PDB file of C-alpha atoms and ligand atoms in Angstrom:
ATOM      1  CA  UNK A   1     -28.437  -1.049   4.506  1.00  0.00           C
ATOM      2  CA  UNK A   2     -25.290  -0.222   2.517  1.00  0.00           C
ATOM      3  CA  UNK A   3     -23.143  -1.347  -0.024  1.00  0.00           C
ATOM      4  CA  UNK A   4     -19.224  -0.323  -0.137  1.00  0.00           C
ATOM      5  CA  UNK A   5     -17.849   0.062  -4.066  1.00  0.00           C
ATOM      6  CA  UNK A   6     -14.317   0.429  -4.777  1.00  0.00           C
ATOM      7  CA  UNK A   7     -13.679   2.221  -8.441  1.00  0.00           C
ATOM      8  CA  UNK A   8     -11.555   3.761 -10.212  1.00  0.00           C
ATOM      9  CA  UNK A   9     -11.246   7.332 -10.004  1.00  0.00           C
ATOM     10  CA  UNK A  10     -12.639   8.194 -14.033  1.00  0.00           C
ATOM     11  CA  UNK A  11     -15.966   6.724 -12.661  1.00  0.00           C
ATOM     12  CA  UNK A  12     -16.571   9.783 -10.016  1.00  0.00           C
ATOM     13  CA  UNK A  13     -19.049  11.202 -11.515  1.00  0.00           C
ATOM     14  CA  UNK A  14     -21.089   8.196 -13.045  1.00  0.00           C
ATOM     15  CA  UNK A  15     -20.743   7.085  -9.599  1.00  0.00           C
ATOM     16  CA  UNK A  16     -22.236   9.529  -7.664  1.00  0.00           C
ATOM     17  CA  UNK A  17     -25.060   9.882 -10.143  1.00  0.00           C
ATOM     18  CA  UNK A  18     -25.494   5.996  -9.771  1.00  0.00           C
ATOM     19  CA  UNK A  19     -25.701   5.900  -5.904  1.00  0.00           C
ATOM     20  CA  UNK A  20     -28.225   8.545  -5.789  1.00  0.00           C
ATOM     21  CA  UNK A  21     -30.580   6.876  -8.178  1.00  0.00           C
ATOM     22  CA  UNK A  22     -29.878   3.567  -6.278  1.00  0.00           C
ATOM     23  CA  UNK A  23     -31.064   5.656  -2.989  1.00  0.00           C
ATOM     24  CA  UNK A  24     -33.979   7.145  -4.319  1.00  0.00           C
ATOM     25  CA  UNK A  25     -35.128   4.280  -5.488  1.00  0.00           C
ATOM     26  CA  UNK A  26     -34.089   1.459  -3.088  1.00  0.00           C
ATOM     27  CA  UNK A  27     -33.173   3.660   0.286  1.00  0.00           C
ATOM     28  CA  UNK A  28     -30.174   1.864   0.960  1.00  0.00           C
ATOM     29  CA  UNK A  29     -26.849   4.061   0.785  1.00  0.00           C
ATOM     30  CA  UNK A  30     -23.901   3.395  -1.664  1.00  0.00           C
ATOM     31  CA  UNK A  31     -20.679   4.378  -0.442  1.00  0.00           C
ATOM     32  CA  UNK A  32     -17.910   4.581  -2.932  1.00  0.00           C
ATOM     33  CA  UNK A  33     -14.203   5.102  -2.975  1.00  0.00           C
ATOM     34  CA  UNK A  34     -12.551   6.550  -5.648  1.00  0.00           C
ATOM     35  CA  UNK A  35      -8.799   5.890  -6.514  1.00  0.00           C
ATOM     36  CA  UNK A  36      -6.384   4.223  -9.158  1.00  0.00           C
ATOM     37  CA  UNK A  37      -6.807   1.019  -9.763  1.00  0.00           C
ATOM     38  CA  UNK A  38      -3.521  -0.269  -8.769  1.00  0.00           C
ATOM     39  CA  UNK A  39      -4.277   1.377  -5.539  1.00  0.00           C
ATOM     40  CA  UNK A  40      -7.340  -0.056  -5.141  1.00  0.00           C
ATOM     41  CA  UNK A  41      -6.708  -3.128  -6.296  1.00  0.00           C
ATOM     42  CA  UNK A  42      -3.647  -3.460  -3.288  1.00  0.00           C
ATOM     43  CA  UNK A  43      -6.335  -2.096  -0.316  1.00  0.00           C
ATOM     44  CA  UNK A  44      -8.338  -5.030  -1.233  1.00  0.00           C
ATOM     45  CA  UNK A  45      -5.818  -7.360  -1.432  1.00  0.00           C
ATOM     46  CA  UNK A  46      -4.442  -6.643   2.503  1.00  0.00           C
ATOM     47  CA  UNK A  47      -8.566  -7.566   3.043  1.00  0.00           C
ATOM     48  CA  UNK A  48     -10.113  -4.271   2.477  1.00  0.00           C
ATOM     49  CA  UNK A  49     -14.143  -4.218   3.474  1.00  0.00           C
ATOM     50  CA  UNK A  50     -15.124  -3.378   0.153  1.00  0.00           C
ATOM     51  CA  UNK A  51     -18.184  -5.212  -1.461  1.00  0.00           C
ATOM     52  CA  UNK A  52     -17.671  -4.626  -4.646  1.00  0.00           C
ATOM     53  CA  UNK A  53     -14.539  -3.368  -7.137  1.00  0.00           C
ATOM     54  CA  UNK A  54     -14.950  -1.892 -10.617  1.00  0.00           C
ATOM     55  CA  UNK A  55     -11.241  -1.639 -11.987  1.00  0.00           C
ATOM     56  CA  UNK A  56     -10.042   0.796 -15.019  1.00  0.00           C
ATOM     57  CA  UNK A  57      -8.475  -2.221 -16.847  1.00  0.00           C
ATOM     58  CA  UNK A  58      -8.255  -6.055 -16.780  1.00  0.00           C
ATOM     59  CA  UNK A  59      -5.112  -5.886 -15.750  1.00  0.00           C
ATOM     60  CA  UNK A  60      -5.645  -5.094 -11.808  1.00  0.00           C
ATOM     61  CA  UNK A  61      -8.887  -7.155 -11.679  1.00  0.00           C
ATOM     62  CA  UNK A  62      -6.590 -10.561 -12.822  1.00  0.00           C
ATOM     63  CA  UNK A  63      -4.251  -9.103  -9.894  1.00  0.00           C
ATOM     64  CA  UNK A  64      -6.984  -9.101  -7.032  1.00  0.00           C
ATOM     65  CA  UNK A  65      -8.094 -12.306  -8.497  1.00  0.00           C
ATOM     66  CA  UNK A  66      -4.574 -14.171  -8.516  1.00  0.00           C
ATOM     67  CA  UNK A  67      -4.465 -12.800  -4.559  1.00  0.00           C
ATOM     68  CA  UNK A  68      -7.830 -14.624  -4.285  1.00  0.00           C
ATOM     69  CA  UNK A  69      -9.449 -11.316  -3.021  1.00  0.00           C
ATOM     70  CA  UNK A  70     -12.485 -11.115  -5.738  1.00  0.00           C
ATOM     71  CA  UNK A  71     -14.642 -14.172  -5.928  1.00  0.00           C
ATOM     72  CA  UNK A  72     -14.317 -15.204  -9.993  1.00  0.00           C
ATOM     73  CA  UNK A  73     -17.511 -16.142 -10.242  1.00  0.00           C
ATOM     74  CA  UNK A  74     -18.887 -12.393 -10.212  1.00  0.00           C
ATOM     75  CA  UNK A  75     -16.554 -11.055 -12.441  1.00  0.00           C
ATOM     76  CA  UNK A  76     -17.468  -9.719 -15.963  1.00  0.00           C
ATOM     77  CA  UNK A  77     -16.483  -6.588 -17.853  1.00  0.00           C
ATOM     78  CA  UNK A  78     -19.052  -4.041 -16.901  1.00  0.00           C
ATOM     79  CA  UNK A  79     -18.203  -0.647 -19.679  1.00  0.00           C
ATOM     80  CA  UNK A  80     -15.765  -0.548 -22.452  1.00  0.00           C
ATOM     81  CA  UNK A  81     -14.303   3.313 -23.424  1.00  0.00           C
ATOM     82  CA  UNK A  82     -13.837   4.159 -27.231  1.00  0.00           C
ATOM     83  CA  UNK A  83     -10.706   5.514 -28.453  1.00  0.00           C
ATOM     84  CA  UNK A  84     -11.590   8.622 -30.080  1.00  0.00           C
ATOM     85  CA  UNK A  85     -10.279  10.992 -32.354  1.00  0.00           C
ATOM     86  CA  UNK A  86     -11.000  14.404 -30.979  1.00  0.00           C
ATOM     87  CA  UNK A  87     -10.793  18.225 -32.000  1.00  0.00           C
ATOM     88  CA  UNK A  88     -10.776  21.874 -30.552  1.00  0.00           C
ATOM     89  CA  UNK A  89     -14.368  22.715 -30.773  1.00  0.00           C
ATOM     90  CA  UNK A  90     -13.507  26.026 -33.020  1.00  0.00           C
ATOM     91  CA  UNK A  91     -12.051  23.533 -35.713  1.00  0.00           C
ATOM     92  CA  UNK A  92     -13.506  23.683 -39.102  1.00  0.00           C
ATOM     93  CA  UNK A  93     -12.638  20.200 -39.160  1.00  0.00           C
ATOM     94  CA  UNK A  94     -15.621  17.903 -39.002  1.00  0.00           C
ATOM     95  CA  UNK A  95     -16.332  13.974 -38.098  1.00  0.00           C
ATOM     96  CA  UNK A  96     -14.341  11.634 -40.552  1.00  0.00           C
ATOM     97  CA  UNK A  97     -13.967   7.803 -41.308  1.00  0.00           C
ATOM     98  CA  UNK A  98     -11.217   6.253 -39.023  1.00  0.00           C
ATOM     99  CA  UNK A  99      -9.624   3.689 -41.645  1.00  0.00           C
ATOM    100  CA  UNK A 100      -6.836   2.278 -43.575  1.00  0.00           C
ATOM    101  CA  UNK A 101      -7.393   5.154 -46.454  1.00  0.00           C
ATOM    102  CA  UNK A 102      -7.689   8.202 -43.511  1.00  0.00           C
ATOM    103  CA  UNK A 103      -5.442  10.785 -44.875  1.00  0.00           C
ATOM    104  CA  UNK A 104      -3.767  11.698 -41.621  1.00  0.00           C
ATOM    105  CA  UNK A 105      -1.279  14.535 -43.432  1.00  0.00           C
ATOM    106  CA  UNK A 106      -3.997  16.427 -44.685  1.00  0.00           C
ATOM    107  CA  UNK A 107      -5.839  16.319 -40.869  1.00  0.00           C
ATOM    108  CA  UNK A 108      -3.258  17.563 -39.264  1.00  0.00           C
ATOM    109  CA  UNK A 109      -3.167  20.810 -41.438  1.00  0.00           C
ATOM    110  CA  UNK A 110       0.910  21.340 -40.969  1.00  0.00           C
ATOM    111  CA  UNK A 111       0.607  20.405 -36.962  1.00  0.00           C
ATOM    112  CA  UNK A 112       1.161  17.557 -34.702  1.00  0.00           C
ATOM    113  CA  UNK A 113      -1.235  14.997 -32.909  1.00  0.00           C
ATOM    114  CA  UNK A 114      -1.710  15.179 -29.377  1.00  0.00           C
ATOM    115  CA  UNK A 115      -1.323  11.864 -27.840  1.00  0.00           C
ATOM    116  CA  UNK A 116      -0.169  10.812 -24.227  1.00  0.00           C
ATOM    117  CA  UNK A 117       3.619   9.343 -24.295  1.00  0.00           C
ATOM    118  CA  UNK A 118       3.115   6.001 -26.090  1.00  0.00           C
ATOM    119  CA  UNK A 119       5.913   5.159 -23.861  1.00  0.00           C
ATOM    120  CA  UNK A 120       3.930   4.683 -20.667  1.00  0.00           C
ATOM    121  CA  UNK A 121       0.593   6.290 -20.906  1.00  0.00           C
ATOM    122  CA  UNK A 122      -2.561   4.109 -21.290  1.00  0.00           C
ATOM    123  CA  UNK A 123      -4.153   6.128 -23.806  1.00  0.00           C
ATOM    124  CA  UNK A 124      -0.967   6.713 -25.936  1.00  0.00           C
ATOM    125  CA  UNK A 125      -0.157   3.195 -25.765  1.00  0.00           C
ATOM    126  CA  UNK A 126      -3.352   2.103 -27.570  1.00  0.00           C
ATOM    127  CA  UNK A 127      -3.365   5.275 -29.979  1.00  0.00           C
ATOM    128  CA  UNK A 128       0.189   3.788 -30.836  1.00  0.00           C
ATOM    129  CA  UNK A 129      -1.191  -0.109 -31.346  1.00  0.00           C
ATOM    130  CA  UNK A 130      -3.899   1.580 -33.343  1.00  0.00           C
ATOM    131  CA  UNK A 131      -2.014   3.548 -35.701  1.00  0.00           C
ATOM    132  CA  UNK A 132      -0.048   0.751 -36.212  1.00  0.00           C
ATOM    133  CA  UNK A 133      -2.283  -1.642 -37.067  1.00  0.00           C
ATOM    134  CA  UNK A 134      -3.950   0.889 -39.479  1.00  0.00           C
ATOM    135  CA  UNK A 135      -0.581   1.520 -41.401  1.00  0.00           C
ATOM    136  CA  UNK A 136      -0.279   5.195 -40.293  1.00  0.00           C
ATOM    137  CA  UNK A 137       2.108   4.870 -37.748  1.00  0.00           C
ATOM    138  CA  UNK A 138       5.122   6.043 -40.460  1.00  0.00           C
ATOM    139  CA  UNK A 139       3.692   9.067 -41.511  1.00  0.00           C
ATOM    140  CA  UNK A 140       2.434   9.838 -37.310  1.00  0.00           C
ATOM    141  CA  UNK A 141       5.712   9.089 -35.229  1.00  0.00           C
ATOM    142  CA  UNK A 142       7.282  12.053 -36.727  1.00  0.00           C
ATOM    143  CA  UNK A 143       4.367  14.441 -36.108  1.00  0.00           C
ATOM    144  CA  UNK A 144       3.130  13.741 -32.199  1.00  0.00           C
ATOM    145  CA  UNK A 145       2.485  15.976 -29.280  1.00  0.00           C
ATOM    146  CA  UNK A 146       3.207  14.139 -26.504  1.00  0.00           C
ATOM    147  CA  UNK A 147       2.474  14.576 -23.226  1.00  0.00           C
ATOM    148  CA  UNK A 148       2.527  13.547 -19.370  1.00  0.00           C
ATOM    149  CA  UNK A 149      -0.920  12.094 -19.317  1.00  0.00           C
ATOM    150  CA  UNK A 150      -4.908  11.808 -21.078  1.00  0.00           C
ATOM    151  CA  UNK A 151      -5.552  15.890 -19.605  1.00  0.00           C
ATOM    152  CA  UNK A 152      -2.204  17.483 -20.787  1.00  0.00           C
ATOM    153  CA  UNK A 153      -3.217  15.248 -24.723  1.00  0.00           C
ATOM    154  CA  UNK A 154      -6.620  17.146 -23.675  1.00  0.00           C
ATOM    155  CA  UNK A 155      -5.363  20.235 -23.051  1.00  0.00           C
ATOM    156  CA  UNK A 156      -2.689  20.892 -26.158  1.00  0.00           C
ATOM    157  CA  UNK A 157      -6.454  20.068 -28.008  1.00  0.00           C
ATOM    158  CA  UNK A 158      -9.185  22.979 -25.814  1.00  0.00           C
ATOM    159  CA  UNK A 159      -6.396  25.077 -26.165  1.00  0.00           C
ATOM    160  CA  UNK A 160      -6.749  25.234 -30.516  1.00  0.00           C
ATOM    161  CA  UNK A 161      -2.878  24.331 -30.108  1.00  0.00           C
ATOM    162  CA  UNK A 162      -3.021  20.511 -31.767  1.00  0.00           C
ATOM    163  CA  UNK A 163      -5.241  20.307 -34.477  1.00  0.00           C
ATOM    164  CA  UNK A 164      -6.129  16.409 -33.271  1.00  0.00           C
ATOM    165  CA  UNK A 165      -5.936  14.404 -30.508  1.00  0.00           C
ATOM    166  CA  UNK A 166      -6.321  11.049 -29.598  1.00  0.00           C
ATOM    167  CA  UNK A 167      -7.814   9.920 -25.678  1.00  0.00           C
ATOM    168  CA  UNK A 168     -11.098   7.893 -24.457  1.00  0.00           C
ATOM    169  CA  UNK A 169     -14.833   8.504 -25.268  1.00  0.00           C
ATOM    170  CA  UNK A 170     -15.296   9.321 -21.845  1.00  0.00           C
ATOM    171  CA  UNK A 171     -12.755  12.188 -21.537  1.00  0.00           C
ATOM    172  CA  UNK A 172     -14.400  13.564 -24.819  1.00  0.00           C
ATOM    173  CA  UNK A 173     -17.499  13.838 -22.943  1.00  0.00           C
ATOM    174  CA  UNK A 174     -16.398  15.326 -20.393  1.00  0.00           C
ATOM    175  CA  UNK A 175     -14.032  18.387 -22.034  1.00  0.00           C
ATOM    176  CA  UNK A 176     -16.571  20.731 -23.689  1.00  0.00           C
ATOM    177  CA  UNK A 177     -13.230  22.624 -25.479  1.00  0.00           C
ATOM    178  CA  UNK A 178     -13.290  19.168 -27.292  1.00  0.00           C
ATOM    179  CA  UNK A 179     -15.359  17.399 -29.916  1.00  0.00           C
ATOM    180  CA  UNK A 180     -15.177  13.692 -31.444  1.00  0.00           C
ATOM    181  CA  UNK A 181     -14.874  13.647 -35.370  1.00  0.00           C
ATOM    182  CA  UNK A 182     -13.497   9.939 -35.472  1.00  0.00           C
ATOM    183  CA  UNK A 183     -13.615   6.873 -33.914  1.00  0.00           C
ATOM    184  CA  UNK A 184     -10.848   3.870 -33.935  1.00  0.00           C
ATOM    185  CA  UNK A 185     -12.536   0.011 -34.961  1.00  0.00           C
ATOM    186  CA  UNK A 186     -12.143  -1.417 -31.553  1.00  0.00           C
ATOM    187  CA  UNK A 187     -10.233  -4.065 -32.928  1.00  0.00           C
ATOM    188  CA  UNK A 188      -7.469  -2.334 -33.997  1.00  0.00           C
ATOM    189  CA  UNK A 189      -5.788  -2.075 -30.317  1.00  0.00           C
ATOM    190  CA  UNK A 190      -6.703  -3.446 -27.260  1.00  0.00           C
ATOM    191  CA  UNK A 191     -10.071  -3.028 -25.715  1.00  0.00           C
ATOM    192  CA  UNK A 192     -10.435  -0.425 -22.634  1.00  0.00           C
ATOM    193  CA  UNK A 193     -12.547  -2.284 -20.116  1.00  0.00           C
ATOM    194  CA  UNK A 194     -13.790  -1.847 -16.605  1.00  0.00           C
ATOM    195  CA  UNK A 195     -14.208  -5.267 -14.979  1.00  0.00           C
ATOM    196  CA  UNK A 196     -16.549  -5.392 -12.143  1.00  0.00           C
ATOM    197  CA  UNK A 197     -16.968  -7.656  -9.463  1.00  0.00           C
ATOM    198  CA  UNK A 198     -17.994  -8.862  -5.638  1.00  0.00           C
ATOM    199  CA  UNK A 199     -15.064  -8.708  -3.212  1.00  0.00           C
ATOM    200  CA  UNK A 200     -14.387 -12.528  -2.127  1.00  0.00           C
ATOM    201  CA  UNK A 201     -16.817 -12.666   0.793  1.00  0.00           C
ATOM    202  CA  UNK A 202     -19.067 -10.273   0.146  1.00  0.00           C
ATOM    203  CA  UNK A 203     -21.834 -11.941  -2.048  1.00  0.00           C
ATOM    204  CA  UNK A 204     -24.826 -11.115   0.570  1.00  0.00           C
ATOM    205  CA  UNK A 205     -28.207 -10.370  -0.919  1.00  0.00           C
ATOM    206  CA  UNK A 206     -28.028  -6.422  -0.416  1.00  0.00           C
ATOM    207  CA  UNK A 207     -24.464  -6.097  -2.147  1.00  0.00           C
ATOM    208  CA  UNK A 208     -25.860  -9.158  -4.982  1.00  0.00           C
ATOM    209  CA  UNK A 209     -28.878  -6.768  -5.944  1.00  0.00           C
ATOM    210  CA  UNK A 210     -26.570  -3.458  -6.236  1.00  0.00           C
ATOM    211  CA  UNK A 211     -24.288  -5.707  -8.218  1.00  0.00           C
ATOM    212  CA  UNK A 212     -27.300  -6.392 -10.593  1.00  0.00           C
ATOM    213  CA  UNK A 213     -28.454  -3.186 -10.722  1.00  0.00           C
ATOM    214  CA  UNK A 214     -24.860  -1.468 -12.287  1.00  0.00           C
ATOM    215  CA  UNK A 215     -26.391  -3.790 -14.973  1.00  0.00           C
ATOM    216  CA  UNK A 216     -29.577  -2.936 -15.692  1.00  0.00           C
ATOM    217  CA  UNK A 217     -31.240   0.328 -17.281  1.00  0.00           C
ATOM    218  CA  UNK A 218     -31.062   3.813 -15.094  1.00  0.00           C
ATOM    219  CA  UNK A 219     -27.074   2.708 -14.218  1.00  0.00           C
ATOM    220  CA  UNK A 220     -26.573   1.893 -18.007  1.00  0.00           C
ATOM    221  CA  UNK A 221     -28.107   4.968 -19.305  1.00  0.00           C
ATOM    222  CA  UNK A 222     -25.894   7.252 -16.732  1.00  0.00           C
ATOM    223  CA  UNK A 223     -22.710   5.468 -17.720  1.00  0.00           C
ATOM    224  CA  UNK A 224     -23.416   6.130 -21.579  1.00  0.00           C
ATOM    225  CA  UNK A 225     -23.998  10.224 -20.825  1.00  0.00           C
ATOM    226  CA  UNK A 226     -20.675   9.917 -19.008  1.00  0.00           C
ATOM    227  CA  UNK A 227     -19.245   8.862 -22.739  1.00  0.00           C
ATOM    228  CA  UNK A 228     -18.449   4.934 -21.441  1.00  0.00           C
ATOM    229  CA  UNK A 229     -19.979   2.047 -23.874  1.00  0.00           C
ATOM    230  CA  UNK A 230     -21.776  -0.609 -21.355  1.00  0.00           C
ATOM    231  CA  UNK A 231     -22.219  -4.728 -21.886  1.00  0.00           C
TER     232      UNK A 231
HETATM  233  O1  LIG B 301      -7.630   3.513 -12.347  1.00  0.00           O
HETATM  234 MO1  LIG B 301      -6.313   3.628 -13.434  1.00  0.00          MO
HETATM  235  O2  LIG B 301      -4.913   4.219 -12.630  1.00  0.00           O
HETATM  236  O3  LIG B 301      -6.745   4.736 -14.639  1.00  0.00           O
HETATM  237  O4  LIG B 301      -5.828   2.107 -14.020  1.00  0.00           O
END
């Protein structure tokens, strides 16, 4: 047998490593197909055959849901991602206490803080809400490195060039020019979730227990050593 999964493209990896667990173990093949959400998300609305969809946020699970195309009942939020604090790996700078009292001048040691645009990009737009809510927003608007997305934030930080930066646990984990030395409160902006959930029609027995199975240990254990938190 087989079971079809739709996810977002930043669970590749994790993925992969998943369905050929869920192979050796079970002989019954996972096929995945990796994309944006918002792509995703629109293939199974025009009645894609996917069994199952993991989205990158909320916000394109509520969308296949409104369009009827994911059956509610299955739906929960399957990994959360940390907002992290991160540093070139040559920095003397080491891990630190993300709070009210973090002295974010002194950090920066006369540069700027890598961040995707807060304008538009995901991670930017929670480092923003973050700072905010933390009261460190004044002293950081003046002193960011923005830039087009999570890897160019990534990049201005492997390359020694921004003494910080601020992107997800899971791109942390996987940038070895790159090391965490703080984590936000996950209350101070809003959470990063991946939703998962059966496609509306697709709740059969061999798609049910693949559905359980992202769950349980040996799928939990390979999200967390991709960086992702799990539920
Ligand atoms: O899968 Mo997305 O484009 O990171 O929301």
């Amino acid at each position: 047998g087989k079971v079809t999964v739709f996810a977002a493209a930043s669970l590749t990896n994790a993925m992969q490593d998943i369905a050929q667990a869920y192979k050796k173990e079970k002989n019954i093949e996972v096929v995945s197909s990796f994309a944006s959400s918002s792509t995703l998300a629109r293939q199974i609305e025009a009645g894609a055959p996917a069994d199952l969809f993991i989205s990158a946020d909320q916000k394109w699970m509520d969308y296949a849901a409104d369009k009827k195309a994911i059956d509610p009942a299955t739906r929960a939020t399957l990994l959360g991602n940390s907002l992290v604090v991160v540093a070139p790996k040559a920095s003397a700078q080491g891990a630190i206490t993300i709070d009210e009292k973090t002295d974010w001048t002194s950090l920066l040691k006369g540069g700027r803080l890598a961040v995707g645009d807060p304008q538009h990009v995901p991670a930017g737009i929670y480092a923003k809400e973050a700072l905010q809510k933390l009261g460190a927003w004044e002293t950081l608007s003046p002193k960011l490195a923005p830039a087009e997305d999570v890897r160019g934030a990534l990049a201005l930080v492997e390359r020694n060039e921004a003494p910080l930066g601020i992107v997800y646990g899971s791109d942390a984990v996987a940038s070895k020019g790159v090391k965490v030395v703080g984590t936000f409160p996950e209350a101070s902006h809003q959470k990063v979730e991946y939703p998962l959930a059966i496609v509306d029609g697709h709740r059969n027995a061999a798609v049910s227990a693949f559905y359980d199975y992202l769950k349980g240990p040996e799928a939990s254990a390979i999200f967390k050593r991709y960086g992702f938190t799990t539920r």
